[model samples]
Target chain A: KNLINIDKPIKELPASIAIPKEKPLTGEQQKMYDEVLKHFSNPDLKVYTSEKNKSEDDLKPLEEEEKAWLTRECFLRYLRATKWVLKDCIDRITMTLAWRREFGISHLGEEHGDKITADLVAVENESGKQVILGYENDARPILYLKPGRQNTKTSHRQVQHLVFMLERVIDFMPAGQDSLALLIDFKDYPDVPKVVGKEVLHILQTHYPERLGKALLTNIPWLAWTFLKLIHPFIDPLTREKLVFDEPFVKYVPKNELDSLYGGDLKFKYNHDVYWPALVETAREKRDHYFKRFQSFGGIVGLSEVDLRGTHEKLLYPVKS
Target chain B: NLINIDKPIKELPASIAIPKEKPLTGEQQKMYDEVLKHFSNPDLKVYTSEKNKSEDDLKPLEEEEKAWLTRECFLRYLRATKWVLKDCIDRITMTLAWRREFGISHLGEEHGDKITADLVAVENESGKQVILGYENDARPILYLKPGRQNTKTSHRQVQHLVFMLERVIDFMPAGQDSLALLIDFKDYPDVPKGVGKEVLHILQTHYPERLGKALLTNIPWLAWTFLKLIHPFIDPLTREKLVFDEPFVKYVPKNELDSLYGGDLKFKYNHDVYWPALVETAREKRDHYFKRFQSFGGIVGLSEVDLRGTHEKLLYPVK
Candidate 1:
């Protein structure tokens, strides 16, 4: 914490980390990929869960453009998860579609504001409790989860805020990268509510599989470590491997991209009204840009992220005149 | 008049059972035979089959996973699909895919270690969800107290209920195929937000026909309004199974029912005694049955009662 300077307000936020191109898929992988595309293209393809039958508001049918949410990048994630089995990939993706709809994840951005003022205030405080800022050196976006600064009661809105922030963080990612770096600050951390904590982990594991780049736990107290043991089973073994205890943030995140609170040079402070809208505006702009570009490329399912952000890559690695 | 002020309440029973499958009709029998023919192939491919192996990563199914593919399992899927043979086959295959990705087979071992280990301490005191005694019809009873919910709402809460369901399946006696649910919303002000729908999804999709009955009591006014909102989402078959604000004594014996519900038993929840006892009994039952199953050649559609070596007279004598 040598770089703490309360007076030094950050002049400018760091830019999105430079992400290189994605590796080409193998010949076998591409064959399986085409099979998945053909499978989901059918209008009659229904991922029948009995829950869908029970509810009056079943999932409405989607046209080609409306189905663009299943990007080419997403196909690979599902394929990798199911070990490239076309049938498993097809089933899992359809199930995820139902889950995302039931979860109301698509509408979180529009629903939050006055409904979750407490969470926004927590994010906007100098404590930076749940802020999306900077990036890891590998270009994954950095999301800070500071339990020490918790200021709200337990509510579903808290979980909503986390999901909402996750959507926005994806907006910050560059073309090649899709994961995010999570830094959990436990300095002076109070009691970790086991119930809520387990719920948060559940959402991350079930809904957002293979999206965490690394989970760096810094400044752990004795109590927090014990709590980790209690809910340890709730966490996925794959995720558990990504958890690093008391690691220096600079190892993966560059000093300039990290905040002073976590052993970096940048002196960052959170001002609720000032920073809140800036984050929203920037996220909206990027998201809208990607969506429009995505539509231009035929907007069918499995559109490539690299193809969508092709020209934009030049701007990041600019050659100074 | 309903309150017995001087009497103490009691804990729920630890184990239960349900009746075996009844005979199918001619039409139902025809559909079941058709379904069985399709899966009779030795090469019948589930999600875990090596049909799509990307490399030399082929592995055999675990014993538990193998045990799940039975004639009885197929019948439940048939009933869930309303006897539509194609839909039943599709659902079975897709559900197999889902179970693989969801890690349903080892869900207990993977997530249950800390959760079940903490059962004696955390859940016992709360009495949030407990697998209690059997109903008069032999269906295992799942006792729930929503008022005891102390945590914020999320998927983990729903997942916890799934864990309980798996444990209840262990207590399922030889002849039993399903369990009864008793939810007492005594002190809860609002419904368990964000939990109702996902839970319904798991039961409906993964564990079809697993709920024999659901008895709800002490329901607050707001919860009724909440139920009305979700009523449309309830399946037609399941909708009939819901019994609200009725006398539980009709289904559970006075000895089996808690005193708070106007019964003879004056049981109290002691976490140390109840939690360990519940875990021990479930473990013992599951282990003994698995041994019986293995000795019976681990064949599909293995009879539950047959494995337990219990004749119908022992569990189901003329009342």
Candidate 2:
């Protein structure tokens, strides 16, 4: 205001390009931001350090900066991301329980106790009980950056850990209870990846030898696992051989078991109205706008930073908690 | 003439009665005059005695009249009765063929020749020869009537005789190849007055196997002789059982070496489309009509006097 437009010398004003502004975070939004920061700062929690460097001292600030930016971006979009994970988990669990109920099993519940820390457990009126667990992980960004490399080692380790947990949980379950464990992961964004790791394969082959090689990996997440387990050996060997090559390892319920599972007067209950549409909307929005930015810059790109805020607001934000 | 055409009536007293007038149609009047002329004709043959005579002694004219009368009566009142027997025969033949076809093993031409004497061996497209034998049977009328007190044995004999003939035709190669047989008792009529024991037992056995057997003494003619020899010791029920028990024996061909003896295939060559149709029609009509008549009577009592004219018309006709 003292010399707002003062022209002292005949020099050309420095040319300036407009730097796009990041969308502002609201006060309530700031809390989410702070929480995410606190989460990163926690010493006990394992932060996925950049693989480019092996030591914290040697770790470049630029890498941290990049990680910090991602964390901030994820925090801004935390409601959406968390909603996706929780809704997906709910959908998977609901489907798993519904499938179990079809086998004359009612009052199926997820057990978080010592005997069963699984995502889903089904109890039949006839005293039969089945346990199911769903796991979802995304390694796409890392996988995309390192092309031609599969996260088989990490996935194998994760499955091993889950199996260990399941073993412990199984010990607590009643003797003679029928139980099943399922590990779901992400193959691509929006797609829930399933377990086909060596550990899982070995377990299925060893314990459920009938279902070892007869599983079909398909879009049917809930039934495919248990269904394959049911019809492990009776399926024609030729069909089984083809399945091994084509889908590799997938479980399917036998037709008879499927009839028993779904055949009666019991109705299947699901929270599809609330969750399915949200997931579909998110996938569509991610595909249309956010995915492009992710493709270009790589690693946890924000919708706001990419000018996809409109899509995020319209599609992703409304349904998310 | 005009006056006569419109003649006036004569006046009558009140106590006088008017005669009942009987009017006849022109055709009826003509028929009446013809009957009168026939009775008045000097050439009309009149039978002097009601003696039993050979069927040959019956003049052809008398036979024609009897046949005509029989036809007229049957068409008017007993058409369905006559038809049921014919229909039953057709169904029985078809059933027999179906049974044989289902039961018999696949026999080659040689065996076929042995089985059916009338079958002619012919080469097919494969250059393999087979004996072509007709598997159908000709229509045979089975008459039924009520059983009389003493005619049980005679009726049983008649049934046994008919059964034996049917069995012979079933087994004989020539008979099988012809696939047609006219089974008739020379003395029986289209419908008999009384059901003889043989006829009663046969109807009971074959048509309704659950019924009690009739006596076997009432069969008429040569059938009685054959039945008495065949089942002399057997009671009426036992005789009926024995008749069905006997296996159909095949008739041996006279000259086994002769090719003609095997078959000339003349039967196949002379195809008759009307034969099957006539047989079927006769069978249908007989079954539909005659079965009811048989049911009306307690037993089948067909005899020559009763069935003569109609039976003759059914068998042989003047064209």
Candidate 3:
């Protein structure tokens, strides 16, 4: 079974991991704030909690250092993404919570790299300006998430490895920057794991909006086709447009930054000794801090018993229960 | 019952504006005929809807499709399900159901709504999104303007997006199996940076394997050192299909492309106008068929309203 099938009990990540608000929230962004709060207030989290006796309302607290930093601003990222529209924000919120409960982000980040997992990770760019991997010619960084040297079990496994790497990047992303480029080199492989097309897309679309600067899928071939065919019909035309094949990226990603694996001059070799500690340490450090917080204070945030039943509007077309 | 009145409208290709009543031609005719032969049979027809329409009410779809229903449209489902007719019928049934459940038709009844306006401005600017003439490779040339200003994060816009994209596919050349997207990011930016995988889900579930190549153009100013930032979201298979800022000029004929993409012609909702116009026009056409469907009782299977509501629960259940 793939990681998507894993039935681990989920808990919300510390509010500390939430993107720190860089700016103030606008008036319109405020409405979406209460709206998302109302979503969490619903019995949804309660349903997720009961089977294992977790909090019916997992509205945990933001740790001491993070409380002031987290703001209506953190929620605004999704609001601005929805263009301040209500249901879009609502759907985004519930879906995010569902993702949190279904596959917790923290679990993925904290795992030690096995032989197969050592390869399915993000590497630091030699240039500090970018996140991990190499930065492109332009503002976007080229994450060499070229997977499968080990395996996600068979074709794919432990999907959170991909998620954790990204969560870290978003947390560290430069203040002004919210997007980056992607390099998916198709160097003769068949049957890309089905998860990237679906669940990874879930992570990208539902959780990480506007994060993909652009993606380059190189090594176009006849018999072997890329996952575009697998994912084409499902991805939005706008996001679909973000994907490119066999194009010269030198204008966007310089040759030096393009790892030689994808035909650029930049050099990268995976060493478990070098790669393992970096990811594992960051994962542990953050988790240690949050786990410690939870231990010290049980269920930090208070649930406001405001009648949220009518606070939020129904979707334009309500999904039948 | 076909509406024969012709008005003085700006005559664009049917790829953009399809009249209310159209005709079946070439491969589309074969598919339509075969579809009738297959679905019209009681076994296939019964699965269409539970609505108690008169047995005689089954009939041909409104003629709006004849002008645009190419082999590719039929093949979209066939290819999606690997040539199983029942599965094709099921998927189409679900999509049609979702369309109505979401009020996709009501969205366009207005020439201008906020969603309509937000989408139409793409056409009005004429800067982004163009539908070029078809290529020898059997792919429709659709120019896309992905990044610009003012992208909405609402589910309302997501529905509108599905509406617009579904309409574009409806306008494909009659026999072509696939369409190529020219993502002029200048094709570099992320409208989807705001637009994400949730919206991308519409494409993933409904339309499968229809895109041939995504040509990403434009050398946006080099502030783009964010590839590392973009790393986690894009999976490898998606990366393989991308064609970046090189001389993609060779792909399209000079005569067919807009001057911006290096051709000699000016493109309009031809990329822009075609969709809204295509959307309104196709619906107006289908409404005609739906109307004729009511009075004439033409095709011997599936009422428009019935199948539209049949599979509503599948994609988004009320629960």
Candidate 4:
């Protein structure tokens, strides 16, 4: 425990995820960019783009819409998440394509996905006291998690549900907005296992890096909180800046906006009945339109399988390209 | 009564909040009293169809059989039907037919070997499985701890459910017919997914007017899907009987419920202790019942005299 990798950066992650501060769109140019990004977001169009660009490589085909609707704001969110680094943003987005396919994220409403999401229903919705009480003062939907709420012997099932719920929350994001705020009541989210917390970080940092605008961590013991402050070398500097302990969080969030669990307003009831059906419905609507053209793999590039026990040899340089 | 089963409630009014305690108005209670008047008559016979139509419609009941029915039991059916006498009678007779078909009276015989101690047993706590006292309205509370499920569903489970329900009724004092079911869904997942509907069908349909109030405390999120799934199959009156997350104070004192269910009573499933007492109680009742059954011609209700000629076809030509 003493031999710690202090300030050691998360190597594979983008440098920082900056919260969006869009005063207004730059009229048509911004509109064009949003159009193009929306086009690129479609998997089927990517496939269609690849077929159109068969003769050339890396030529992202122009979307059918001629109006320079394909120009810039669509990629703006990614650029901000990666600290205005376009190349890093592109790399993050590309990797996410594979991860999404492998994990079958698009079909979250289907049997396989719903099986995991079924258990992630928000249980606490007391006006003030709640594990997942409600929105933050910023009006950004918040998720306040405590150990007792995650009390489960079925750890694997719980982890899967956490991911599924995140997918749903992302889908719930309002128009032009692409992120949600998270409040982990644990000492810190990092205290949990890879599948529980770190995996969420890795996935968000890859596919939805900008998705987390801020994280409010409460009840962290002093030592760990100090360690958290010191661990920026291991974290994205921007996300680190957004990270604050619960004490200061109250200045931003009002009692009505906050939940009863955190000594806030004692009002809203948590009705899972009211919230859950809509979530499932949204997932269902997104399934087809979202994955219209996400086809199977075409190239024989990466190694399919490896027998690490004996057959596979250790490569000093694991990089493929 | 919160939603008012007396009237057809198509949708909830957005502005008004639902009260935790059910509302039983004076007008509604007066109507309930009138229902009691009908069943109190010794000549009342619930029949599924016309006596002239099918021999199975209405069977002759001895005076003891009529005496066995209580006002508490009789009144519950009215609540299930919102005091609609005709509909309540129709439902009750259907239940009678089902009881005969299912052989509910002879459950001890069928379930004698099948039921072990605490198979569908009660816990040893002030508020673990059964309530010690009544609510202000004279309703006995029966708490179902699904966490102690022993095995998967089968005939044994069906029989066990019947046996448990029968025993719950035994806990009610005179003038206390309605039962409040407090089902704890905490740390337990054996919700009768498909079977709960089947059991509820009998309870709400055949049993007629039994639930005074029902609560599903500590409900898990995923479970609402199934609860909604079964909503269509039951009557609106029966639907009105259940209220999810009802506070313990609404039913019993906090100390009466086990601590695990947010009550003060320390509770754990001790089958060794509770099973014997119930078994002893059940055995005594079973032997006594059989002795009575023998005196009245056991197999069919014909030992006293042959009433086949006096069966329904020869009686009133009513369906």
Alpha-carbon deviation at A224 in model 1, angstroms: 4.3
For candidate 2, lDDT tens digit of each residue in B102-218?
Answer: 221112112121222122111011111111222112111111222211232333334333332232222222111111111112332332332233333333322321111121222
Task: Please list the residue runs of candidate 2 whose C-alpha ends up more than 4 Å from where it truly belongs after superposition.
Answer: A1-32, A35-58, A61-73, A76-288, A291-321, B1-319
Model 2, span A34-144: residue lDDT tens:
554554444443322222233344322222223213323334433432333434322332232232222222211112122222222211101111112111111000000
Model 3 segments more than 4 A misplaced: A1-74, A80-83, A106-131, A137-141, A147-152, A155-157, A189-201, A223-237, A282-321, B1-319
lDDT of 1 by residue, B1-319 (tens): 2322211112223443444468889999788767666655445556552124233432344565545655667888998787888999887766665566544653245323334444324433556776766677777778888677756666666657666777788777666677888887677554242355455456557887787888878764433543443344455665677777578888887666666776665655656667777766766666676666576566555555665544433231111
Residue-wise C-alpha lDDT for candidate 4, range A231-270, written one tens digit per residue: 3333445545667674756665555455544555544343
Model 1 residue runs over 4 Å out of place are A1-24, A43-57, A63-66, A107-128, A189-202, A223-241, A310-321, B1-319
Supply DockQ values for each candidate: 0.02, 0.00, 0.02, 0.00
Model 3, A1-321: lDDT tens digits are: 111211111121222223223465677665557666555434334323111234546543322322211223334566777877878875664455445544544132334212323344433211111125555544443455544232334222445566655655443333234566777654533443322344454466567765776778665432123223544544556666787765676655655555555566645554545545564555455445433433343322222111111122222212112
Instruction: Judge the docking of candidate 3 as incorrect, acceptable, medium or high.
Output: incorrect
Better of 2 and 3 by DockQ: 3
- Evaluate residue A258 in candidate 4 and report its C-alpha lDDT on the 0 to 100 scale: 57
iRMS (Å) per candidate: 16.8, 39.9, 12.8, 24.8
Better of 1 and 2 by lDDT: 1
- Residue-level lDDT of model 3, residues B1-319, one tens digit each, is 1222111122224443222223445755454456546534444322112233345533333222221222334456655676567777666555443443444423243422234535544432433444445543545566666554344455654655565564445344433335677765443353333234455445665666677667766633221222222433456655555566555656655544556666655543333445455455545544543444334333444333222222332221111
lDDT of 1 by residue, A227-295 (tens): 344234334566566667746878878887788877787677766666666777777666566666766
Give residue A280's lDDT in candidate 3 (0 to 100). Answer: 50
